[PDB]
């Protein structure tokens, strides 16, 4: 349609110039003429965009239209001689209404310059094969007759090969299987079979601990969750018990030899469990139940230490505030647990190994929470409250958090 700028704004423009008592008709004459010129330039810019096929448009397209109009394209400056700057586009000014209009040159130096992209390259992909579009990442996607499975037999064989690679016998095969699951749209609809395979492996792993195998199963779970085509939420109900059992499972193998794997297994389980809660979040659907299970294990007296460590790892992962609120009432209980494992002349018992894992996770999580609540102070008083459970190391961890804040 036809739109004109306000007459009062034209009068203000004359007032800045110092012109006064301008005719009302003259104000109307200025607005109708200016509006036509703006519309004419917009149509001219559209012609450049249509030939360009950019659609989004590129900076200086209006400047090209101004050059076509034989009018200077410079914005925010003009040269009377016109020799230093000609019809070459100024490029415009990067200024916004939000901008304060006052800046410090030193602050701009402090800001890092961005990295530069590689030159344009040409890649060939098959849009269609024999008139059928392939499902690839580059592309957008009275006896009755015997019933046949919906999945293709070749696809079922492909699923079998991926599961064999996922077992983790060869690291390269497991990595390739994870990449294939992430990049394959066709893998969708094989998710119920994949979820059942993980659950069957996990239940056997509960009977005899297989921490290395459990970590490989978690890698397969991560690959399935990342792929967009499959519906993770529909089969999430099978996945959640399997991840929970792995985090709280007792270690059949000697604790010191497999301790590094056990910490990694708990870390993998806590991350996937929080991601499952994030997926399809609803009030009291996943997060409330998982938090309740972790809290019930921790509160229970004489809880297995491996179970306690898994519950503590899960609670810390769900929220930073959740660990901070829970630790303060149980801080005396946590100190008592460390004293109970310390008592006795035998280090063979797993209770000491479980306690050291729980305390180490608590100390690292506590240092940021203490810094967030207030600047670190009275470190000796804090050690007295802990009854020297970590002694100097707890004070050192708080100092390390302060040093990290100073570095940032």
């Amino acid at each position: 349609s036809n739109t004109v700028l306000p007459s009062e704004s034209m009068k203000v423009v004359a007032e800045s110039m110092g012109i006064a008592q301008i005719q009302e008709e003259t104000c109307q004459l200025l607005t109708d003429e200016v509006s036509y010129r703006i519309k004419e330039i917009a149509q001219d810019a559209l012609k450049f965009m249509h030939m360009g096929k950019r659609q989004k448009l590129t900076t200086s397209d209006i400047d090209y239209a101004l050059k076509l109009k034989n009018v200077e394209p410079l914005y925010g400056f003009h040269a009377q001689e016109f020799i230093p700057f000609r019809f070459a586009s100024g490029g415009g000014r990067e200024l916004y209404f939000y901008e304060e209009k006052e800046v410090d040159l030193s602050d701009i130096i402090n800001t890092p310059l961005p990295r530069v992209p590689l030159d344009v390259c040409l890649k060939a992909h098959w849009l269609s094969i024999e008139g059928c579009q392939p499902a690839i990442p580059e592309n957008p996607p009275r006896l009755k007759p015997r019933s046949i499975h919906e999945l293709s037999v070749e696809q079922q064989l492909y699923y079998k090969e991926i599961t064999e690679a996922c077992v983790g016998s060869c690291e390269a095969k497991r990595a390739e299987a994870l990449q294939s699951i992430a990049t394959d749209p066709g893998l969708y609809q094989m998710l119920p079979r994949f979820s059942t395979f993980i659950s069957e492996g996990v239940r056997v792993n509960v009977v005899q601990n297989n921490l290395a195998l459990l970590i490989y199963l978690m890698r397969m779970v991560k690959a399935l969750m990342d792929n967009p085509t499959l519906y993770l939420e529909k089969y999430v109900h099978e996945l959640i018990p399997a991840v929970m059992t792995c985090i709280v499972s007792r270690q059949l193998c000697l604790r010191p030899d497999v301790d590094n794997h056990w910490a990694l297994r708990d870390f993998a389980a806590r991350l996937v469990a929080q991601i499952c809660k994030h997926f399809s979040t609803t009030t009291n659907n996943i997060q409330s139940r998982i938090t309740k299970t972790f809290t019930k294990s921790w509160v229970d007296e004489k809880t297995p230490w491996t179970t306690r460590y898994g519950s503590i790892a899960g609670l810390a992962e769900l929220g930073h505030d959740v660990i901070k609120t829970l630790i303060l009432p149980r801080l005396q209980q946590e100190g008592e647990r460390i004293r109970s494992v310390l008592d006795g002349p035998v280090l063979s018992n797993i209770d000491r190994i479980g306690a050291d894992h729980v305390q180490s996770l608590l100390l690292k999580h506590c240092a940021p929470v203490l810094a967030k609540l207030r600047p670190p102070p009275d470190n000796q008083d804090a050690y007295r409250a802990e009854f020297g459970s970590l002694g100097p190391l707890l004070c050192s961890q708080v100092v390390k958090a302060r040093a990290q804040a100073a570095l940032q």
């Binding site: 239940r203 509960v206 009977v207 939420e233 529909k234 999430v236 109900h237 959640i240 018990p241 399997a242 929970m244 059992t245 399809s280 609803t282 659907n285 996943i286 139940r289 299970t293």
Partner: peptide, 25 residues
């Protein structure tokens, strides 16, 4: 509100800990 697919989802209506065998006979 009660007719939402999420309301009838198995995860909402199932208790996960009971499902795990936990080496229990």
């Amino acid at each position: 509100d009660l007719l939402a697919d999420e309301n009838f989802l198995m995860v909402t209506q199932l208790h996960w800990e009971d499902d795990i065998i936990w080496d229990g006979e």
